[PDB]
Amino acid sequence: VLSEGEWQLVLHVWAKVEADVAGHGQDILIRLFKSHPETLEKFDRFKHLKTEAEMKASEDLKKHGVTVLTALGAILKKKGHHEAELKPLAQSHATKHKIPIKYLEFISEAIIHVLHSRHPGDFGADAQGAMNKALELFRKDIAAKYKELGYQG
Ligand code: HEM
Numbered sequence: 015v016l017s018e019g020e021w022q023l024v025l026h027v028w029a030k031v032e033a034d035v036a037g038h039g040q041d042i043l044i045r046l047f048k049s050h051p052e053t054l055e056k057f058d059r060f061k062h063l064k065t066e067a068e069m070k071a072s073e074d075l076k077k078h079g080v081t082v083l084t085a086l087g088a089i090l091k092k093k094g095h096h097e098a099e100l101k102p103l104a105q106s107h108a109t110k111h112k113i114p115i116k117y118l119e120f121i122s123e124a125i126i127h128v129l130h131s132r133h134p135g136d137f138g139a140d141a142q143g144a145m146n147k148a149l150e151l152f153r154k155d156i157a158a159k160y161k162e163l164g165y166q167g
Pocket of ligand 1: 081086118121
């Protein structure tokens, strides 16, 4: 599992993300969309935005970045005991949104990059390793639920 010490590192960085969720979630989604254009085609509501400027300008995109980080936050503060939060998310993303497990790996890279941009002194190699472990556990448990449903990535 993650140690209690690695959970400390994780949550101490997330409490700073919580100071500007809407700004963090907007950077993250933007980085996802640009590095991996195919993910944007998953979103009928966003599929019109072609440039970075248009993305930055959208209130609705910012609303959805708040949705995602809040749900991730709920999960991270359960330190592993996240079965009840995670189960509905796997079901919707499997059966309704149809999101490949690989795209969950892409947004995981985006979160880590943005956390490093916005919080260097605070997000050293050690906190980087703890956060990547916590995201892998997230991916790992959703992937198990996908397999059960017949979607396995
Ligand atoms: C940490 C990653 C993610 C979290 C915590 C997360 C969380 C959520 C939540 C809470 C919702 C709204 C309720 C739901 O539909 O069940 C949602 C909706 C959605 N998510 Fe995810 N999501 C994540 C990653 C992704 C990725 C990587 C994609 C696409 C590449 C994606 C695409 C969508 C779409 C299409 C919706 C619905 C948007 C709309 O209202 O039309 N999600 N997600």
